[PDB]
Structure formats: C-alpha cells, structure tokens
Amino acid sequence: YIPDYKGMEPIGANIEDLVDYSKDWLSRARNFSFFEVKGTAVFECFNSNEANHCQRYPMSRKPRNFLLIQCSLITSYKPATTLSDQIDSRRACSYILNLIPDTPASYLIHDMAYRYINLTREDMINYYAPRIQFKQTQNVREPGTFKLTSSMLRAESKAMLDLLNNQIESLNIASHIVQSESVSLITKILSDLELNITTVLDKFFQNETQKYLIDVLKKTTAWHIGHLIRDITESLIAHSGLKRSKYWSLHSYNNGNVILFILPSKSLEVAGSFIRFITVFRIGPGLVDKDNLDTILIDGDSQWGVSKVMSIDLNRLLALNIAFEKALIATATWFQYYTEDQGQFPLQYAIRSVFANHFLLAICQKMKLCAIFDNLRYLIPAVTSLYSGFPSLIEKLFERPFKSSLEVYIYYNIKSLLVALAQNVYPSFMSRIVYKHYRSLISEVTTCFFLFEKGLHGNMNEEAKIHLETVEWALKFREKEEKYGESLVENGYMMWELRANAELAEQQLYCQDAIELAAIELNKVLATKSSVVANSILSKNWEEPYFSQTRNISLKGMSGQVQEDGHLSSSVTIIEAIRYLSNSRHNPSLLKLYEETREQKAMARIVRKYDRGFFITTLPTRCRLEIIEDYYDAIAKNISEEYISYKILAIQGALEKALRWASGESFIELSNHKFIRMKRKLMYVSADATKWSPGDNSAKFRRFTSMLHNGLPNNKLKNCVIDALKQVYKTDFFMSRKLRNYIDSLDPHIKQFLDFFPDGHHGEVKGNWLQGNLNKCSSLFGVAMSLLFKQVWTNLFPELDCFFEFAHHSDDALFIYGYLEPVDDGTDWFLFVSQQIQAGHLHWFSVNTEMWKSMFNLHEHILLLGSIKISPKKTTVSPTNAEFLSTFFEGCAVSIPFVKILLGSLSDLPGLGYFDDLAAAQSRCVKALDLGASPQVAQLAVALCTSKVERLYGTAPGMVNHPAAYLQVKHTDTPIPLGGNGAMSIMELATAGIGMSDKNLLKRALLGYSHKRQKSMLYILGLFKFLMKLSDETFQFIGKVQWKIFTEFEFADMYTSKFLELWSSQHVTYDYIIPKGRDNLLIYLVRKLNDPSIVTAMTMQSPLQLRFRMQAKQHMKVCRLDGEWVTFREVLAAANSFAENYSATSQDMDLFQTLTSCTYAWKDFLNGIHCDVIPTKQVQRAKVARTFTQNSIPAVIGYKFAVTVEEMSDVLDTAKFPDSLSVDLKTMKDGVYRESLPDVMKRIARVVIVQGNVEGTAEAICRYWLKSMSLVKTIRV
C-alpha cells in the first residue's frame, strides 16, 4: 500500500530560456578555474607558500625529535631469549655503572642500573621465571619488573620523575641552512641503514624473490635493526599490562650494546595511556639522532648515547612491533612494481635504499608525513597534466607546521620531484631510477601512504575539523536562507530570478528550471526503456519486511535514542532493530515503517572511533535514505550501459566514440560557400564532480524525482520518494561528548561554533544529507545535468560540430571535450568569428580561441545551476594522452591497491584463537592476491603473517607451545587447531580455500588407516575425534579449541542462554535462513548478538580491551577443556592422552568418510598442471575484473527442517521460487543418497583482478595465477 503523499506540480521550463541565458553568459569574458603547469609556476608557488608559512607560524631553531626508539647495530643480531636477556642485562648494568652520569635522565639511568645489579639470586630467579613458577618477593612483585622506592633514587632523578608527573611553532622551511641540515641528517641515517652488517612456486620464489630481494636485504643494517626494534617493542608490550605497568623494568639486547629502561606508567589497557622508557645504546651506525639524544656519556674508546624519556602510545607501539614486516612487504610491492614497469630486477643499491626508506617511514608514524603523502597522491597527477589545481594542493601541503627533520627532508624531496615533473620518463622518489610509466610512481606514493596506520586518523583534531566544516556549511546555509528567504532556498530559484541577480548561481542554491530540464534530458533516454524501468523499480520488493534484510541488521552503526543528558547514543544497527522489534507488535515493511516514523525528526551524530566519513543516523533517517536509494538505484541501473559506470564497457564505449570523432575531419560552411578546414582535437578532464560535499541542497532531488519518468502507472511511489526527500531535509546534528569536553576544558571560531548550538548538545542543519547513502541519486543527477549541458551546447553552436562525451564512475568523472582548431593558423577563423559577432551572435566571442576552455566554463556553470561544484583542486585536464587514459582506466579497475590489504593483515587480527586469526591472516593475503598481488609477493606476506601468528602463540619450533613436543606427530602432520605448520602455499589457499590443510590431512589419515592400518594414522584420527568432541561441547570446521574471549550490550541478555540453545535446537531452519516474523526474528537477532565472532567485531578497536587484552594471556590458561580454563599445553597433553587410547569405531569411520566426501578437485588440478618457461619478454596488459566461481541453497535446507506453519511460510517468503522448493528437495535428497538424516545434512551444509586475456572461468583464473608466478619470464601451461 502506498499513501497519498501530496507530491509536486510540474512547472513550465523551456530549453530556450536556458539557451538564451547561456548566450548572455558566454558573450562576456570568463576566467578559467585551472592554471597551466610550467615548472616555473610550480617553483614560484612553492616559494610563495614557503614565505607565507614562515610568516604564519612562529619560527623555531631546535627541530623536534622523530625517532621514537633510537638504537645502533654494528654486528649481526640474534633474537633475545631469557638466558641471553640475563647475560645482556648483567653486562649492560656493569657497563652503565662504570660510566659517569651528566643529566637527570643519566642519573636515573645509573640509579636503576645500580639497583638492578644488587638484586638477590631469589629475585633474579623470579625476575625471569614464567608466571607458573613465579613467586612474589620483596623487590620483585611481578614477573619482569622490580620496585624502586625514593631511597635509592637520587634527588635529580626524582626531579625527572616529578617533571614527568606534573605556542605551536614550526621550522624555517624557506631557509637553505635548515633544509641542508635536515637533508644531511636524514641522508646519514638512510646511508647507515643501507650499510651491510659484518612446488614450482618454491622454485620461482627461490630463483627471483629470495635471490634479488631477501638475499640482498638479509645482510643490511635495517633488517637487524628491525628485528631489534621488534624485540624492544615486544618487551615494552609485555610491560604494558595492568599489574606490571606500576613497576620499573630493565632489559638488554645485542651483547649488552642496547639497554631499555621502563619507568612506571599508566597501563595501556585504559585509553590515553603512554608507556614511558629510556633507551641507552653504544653510539654507532643506525637510527641515531645525536642532536635529540639526551646525553652522550664518554667511555674509553667508546660513546654511550642516552635518549630522552620517550612516551609511546598504544597504536604507535603496535605499529612499531610490526615495522620490519611492513617495510619488507612495502619493499616487495615496490619490487613487483619495478619488475612490471621495466621487466628487469632492481639492483642491489636500489633495493637497499628503497627498503631503508620504507623502514624509516614505518618507524616514524607521524600525522604530518601521512597527510603529506596523502596530498602527494593527488599532487603527482596534477603536475603532469596541462592544466590543474596544483596551487590549491601546494597550499594544502603547508597546512600543518614542520616540526621534525624528517618532515623537512620529505618536503624537500617532494619539492624537487614535483618541480622536475612539471618541467616535462618519471623520476622515482627514494632511488635513482626513472620509471617508464608514471603509474609506477603513483603506486610508489600510495605504498608510502599505506605505511601509516589508519589509527593515526581521527585524533581529536580531525574530529574537530569535520565538526567545524559541518557547522560552517550549516551557517552558510542559514545566511543564504535569511538573505533570500526560506522558500527560495528550499524550492530553488527560477530562471528569471537568476537573470535578474546573476549571483544566485552558487552552491546550496539550485535552479528549478535547471532541474526540470535535466530531468527532461534524462527522460529522453529513459522513455525507450519504460517497461524495464518499471520492472526494476517494482523488483526492489517494497512490500517485504524491513528488518528481515541483511542490511538492516548489520553492524553499520546508527544513532540510538536521545538520552536524559541530551546526547545521541551511538549504537549498532542490530541493536536498534532489536529495540524497535521489542517495542513494536509486528515486522513492518519499508513503507509501513516510513509511515510509522514520518513524524520523527532526523537526528544525526558522528561515530566515536571506527570517523569523519561516518555520520551515523537514527532509524527513521536510515529508512528514508533507503527508500530514496532503492528507488534511484532501481531507475539508474538501466542507463548504466552508457553513463553510470558500476561499467568499464561504458568508459570504453565513450573513448571509442571520442577517438573515432577526432579521426574524422570537419569543414565549416560560410556565406560565400568557402568551406574552412577545421582540425578536431580532444581534451580530457578527470573531475570528481559526484563526491558528497558538505555544502549542497538535497531538496533539488524532489523536483528531479517529480519529473523523472518511470514506467509505473501510478504516482504513489514517486510521491512517497518525494515525501521521503522532504523529510530528510532538516536534521539534528549532535555534538560528541569527547569534543564537548575538549572544548569545555576561547577562540572566536570556537565561539561561533558554540552559538550554533542553542542547548549545547544539538543544532539544526538543513539541506546537507550528512554523507547518507544517496550515491545513485547524486550520480543520476550529475549525468542528467551533463546531458543538459550537452543539449545546451548543441543548441548554442549548430553550425559548429563540437563533441562532448562523459562517464561517471563512483566519485570520479571523465569529460571529453572535442573542439576545433585552425589548420592554416590564418586569420580566416578569426574573420568568421568577427563576422558572427557582428551578425548578432554575441556569444561567439568566447569561441574565438581555445574552444575547449569555453566548453568547460559552460559545463561548470550549468553544473553550478544545481549544487554541483567541480572542485578547483583535484581536477586535472590533459590532451589525448595514453598514460592519462591508462591510469584513469586502472583507477577504474583496481578499486583497492593490494598493499592496503597486505599491511592490514599484520595490523589487525580477530584474536578468536590460533586457528581463527591464522585463517584471517591467510584469508587477507588471498584477497590481496585477488586484488592484483603477484603470487610471490602474496607468498612472502603469507610467510610473514604465519610467522607472526606462530610467534604470538609460541607454535614455532623451539618454543613452549610447540605441538611436536607432546603430540608425538610431526609438526607438519599436526592438525591446525593444535599448532599446525599452518603455512601451505598461496596457490593452495587461493584455489581450494583456507581450511584444506585439515581435510587433506584427514583424508590421507583415513587412507593411511584404510589400507595400511598404521598406528600413527589412528593417532591422527584420534586427534581429529578429540577436536570434534571439543566442538560438540562448544555451543554454536571439523573441530576448534575454544579460546577465552574478553568482553556488554543492552539487549544481549534479553533471553537466557539455555532458552537460546533450546530454541536453536528446536527451530533448525532459522540457522540457515532469517525468520520473517517479529516474535521469532527477535530471538534470532538476540542469538546473533551472543555469537563470539561478532562481539570481537564490535569491540575490535577497543583500546586494549581487544588489542593487548589477549596479547597478554598468550601462555596462560585461555583454552577451554573439561569445563575449565586451561593452558594450551594442557590441551595438547589432553589431546595426546585421548589419541593414545583412542579406539576406532564404525560410527567415527562413517563420520570421517562423509566429511572427506563432502570436502572441485582444486588440489588435483594444481598437481596435474605442467608449466614450462619460454624465453620471451613479458607484456603488461590492462587490468580487468572477473568473477571466480535454481533455488537458493539455504531455502531447500530450510525447507527440510520446516515443522510449523510459520517456518514453512517464512521459507516460502525468503525463497525466490517458493513452488520449486519441494522439487529441489525431491532431487537433492536422492543426490545425497547417491553420494535424509538431520545431523548429516547439518554438517554437510570473488572478484579477481586479472589481465584482459583471462576468461571468466575459474580454471582460467587459476591458469592466469600460474602464469603470473614469474615476475620477468613468461610461462606456458
């Protein structure tokens, strides 16, 4: 049912009025929005911005520090163990004691070393024993700590502690001396870091990756420095616990050459806590910043550098712990990109220098460098294009002050690189190589950008920036509304109003005539496809229940109810769905929910920490946005073949028309019949016209929806969409408590931001839909207005044969303007222009020279007739350029660079247990391999991730939790949940999946017991049976050891757990499909809250409650066994005992046989495929996305266990064809019988970026992956 919803009345809009206005507009001189690049222009822009920056910020003489941990290495480094730690600590304390301190930091250092050296044997035994053997003593209260009362502490040392317990300036960038000093320092550091210290996939890896990358980087100083920093950060993390952060600690590494002194600090579990330490090292080559060192104590024929008290937060610590892996993966990505670019391996010096630069970037995680690289990502294309917004970007480069010497060196390198690029083979950024294609340079800068953790973003400065941006645009909207009236701003102005004012053409101010004409131009195309438009609109299923869909019960994040304190509650979508279902009496449809929540105001907030991009909104706002998005996505999919890319063929189709039109030549007629030969040229603009802008007006869409012609017979749905757009007009923006407290704890901008809120917890914002999902609506509007500009231009110059073709993919948009230039370069064209301008065609003044400039000016103005503004910065216009088109097509093709997923895998883990996070790490590297990563790079990433996971859980050989110590089976043949080699290969993981090791093992084990009846095969079967027993004990693959999960929600305990288990057992069908009714959907959603895999996702960013909460237990009692919390060693021993006495049974054999039978012959293909190399140079092709692959599978399974009328009706409703369901079962069971009982059925139960040659078959994808195994040499399968 659709209610009457007023609707809108059509107005009389004539294209001739717009054409006349365009004539009047073009009759005068207009300025261009972009500046020509010349090299000199970029250099003067840099100089002027340098002078302005020097004037703006106060000048400082002493640069700040940038090395969080300073250390030096002369010899090779071996990982630190307990006995090595003992010997190192003793030697280091002796070395410190023989010295003479100078400053309070040195006095504290000497005092702590002297206190450590005088500990008794009992304390030393307890200082290094694990928790099991640990005993509290007088001087040692926690495993790796000791106390320090005031008595041993000196007066000065205490001074440091009291100073610890108890304006903005920048460097002189314009000065040549500061730049020279910073460049010299960073060059010294980098040169020290580069100094040397003194299956078939395996074959290809050892031939290429292990030889030219890992063998080269194995001997460098940066490799061992990264390992040393990993050890130091591991020791710091071990000290960040709740019970250990209160006391001091001392550690040593590298034969007594590096020492770490940990001071008392607030535990990192509570947010905003900094672990404080002092690092003391013998001064030598490496991460040494002598100026920023606290002291340099003198020793005979030696120097000992003592750093200042370094405070490192949580995310910085976690980033430093994985800095070496991030640097290695970035270097591997650069290695792959170099091989792609040039076809030859990088030499020694190039690889060493790029690895040193990546390591230095990964060590120093600073906001300034992250912003600098983010800006450079767009600065590079803007400098290679004929015209662009480069000054706006160069001005953005100086937003923040330059504090450390690292920022000055990076800025100097960027300035040199940009000036070299604009003068124009493209120079590199951290080496002496010139790339053949600048896409390699863009990828290099992108890899550098992704080396910075996505936790740096946010802070309290970024949230303030986005808040002030929103408030500034809201205040601008209020000013415009009071200046022109409420009605004119909301409903838009008319053509004659704009003609009279000649100013209303601005942002947050649209023209009704423009909207109507754009809708008419869209309807021109839309009329021929009315039937399919109506079918697609009706196919959105507006009648199905709202909360039974997956998008409405996800973890997206929505605003809750307003509280008594007046602040909006951030919460989860599923929680709000549960709340509504509990308060409601049914499960309403989309339109019914909109009817119920039409009167409620739209409230909005900002996500706490997950943050500028997510304006979380309440349920009614989401419902209205979903109505509008469903309608506009339904009507917009039909013209996706030509204008709205979702796709590549549309962009290819537009370019083909442009090139063909340019190939043909044109003649213009004359009154004297003297045809004039015109040369056709093309100009390409890469504009981000359709991004969401804070300054905008949603109300325009109303009129658009009023005139957009669908095939529906009634106007009920159109009026409903218009009413939803009307209700999403006004919103109640809410202050975040963090920002409120930060501001409460004087600036005029802050003052005016405060007056924007009457009550200090909320203020009204109008016309800004606050980043809500209206992407399809915005893209459709942009396409319609581009078509309107095309029509206006064709009406403006009928005699001229100009060309305009546009494509809109996501936020980016490509405009191609085909213009006419004189061939003879004579005055005949200007003579004709003069004749036309004298004949009354005054608008021909702007066509005299540079027709494409006037074309773009008119296009930008026509877009401005709405709220669309082509961003001055970030738009780049170039002639017909193969590289430009190639990078545009690549950015349209490679949606996400694989290096983002690669670095992300080491940065975050689920922490649900060894198997779970190992699977997640292996899955992320597989997804990156899908995204375009070379198999060798993905194999390297897999190795690094698996090694990190093994280090975390002590599974690697020669560690406490090694399965081979007790399980009497080889580490390779051990099941994955108990520690299992868990390495395999990237090909096996990508093709088969992320669990094949267990089945292959089980399968062979079954065979090993079926034919030879060997004892070890029976042992493996016993281990598998033990895992199945543990899984049976655990409540909702073969079997998983349960690991402790640390917690918490409003409705998470609405029903008892035993009732949930009983309901899940009784209503089996709801496990496979979602229950439509409210009384059962409520219980299903409550069950979804208690799922362990979801709680870890809601709190995955919790400050330590997840990040180090379980990186602390590691070797404690965290596993579940026999209803007890026990150590992993105890679980391994229990598994060994169970498997030793396990006796084979017929039922277990049947279960194992069924599981093996259930688990495409992907492994068999990889064994049977043959690959032989050919001596032929590799060729790089365009990147293209492919897919790797009657009733739905769950519906038939859901139908199988249907026992009541409600369940059977629900499985009808969710199924596409509810009639065929029985037939499916009727055959499916027979198939099972040829391969029934409930339990057997219960246990029975990808976009890939490739080259253009690859087909859409999964075998073709696997063959391509096999071909891409060699970075230089081609392969034949």
Author numbering: 226 to 391, 401 to 432, 449 to 674, 700 to 885, 891 to 926, 931 to 1029, 1033 to 1323, 1332 to 1342, ...
Q: What's the publication's text?
A:
Hantaviruses are causing life-threatening zoonotic infections in humans. Their tripartite negative-stranded RNA genome is replicated by the multi-functional viral RNA-dependent RNA-polymerase. In this context, we have focused our interest on the replication of the tri-partite negative-stranded RNA genome of hantaviruses. HTNV-LD97A core consists of a central region containing the canonical palm, finger and thumb domains of RNA-dependent RNA-polymerases (RdRp) that together form the central cavity containing the active site.
The flexibility of both the N-terminal ENDO domain and the C-terminal region precluded their structural characterization. In the apo conformation, a positively charged pocket is present between the vRBL, the finger, and the core lobe in a conformation suitable to bind the 5′vRNA end. A positively charged groove is also present at the polymerase surface between the vRBL and the thumb-ring, suggesting that it might correspond to the 3′vRNA secondary binding site. In the apo conformation, the groove entrance is closed by two elements that we call the upper and the lower jaw. The apo structure adopts an inactive conformation that involves substantial folding rearrangement of polymerase motifs. A global comparison reveals that the motif E adopts an unusual α-helical configuration in the apo map and switches to the canonical β-hairpin strand structure upon 5′vRNA binding. The observed folding of motif E as an α-helix has a significant impact in the relative position of the thumb and the palm, which induces a differential placement of canonical motifs and inactivity of the polymerase. Of particular significance is the conformation of HTNV-L in its apo form, that had, to our knowledge, never been observed for any viral RdRp.
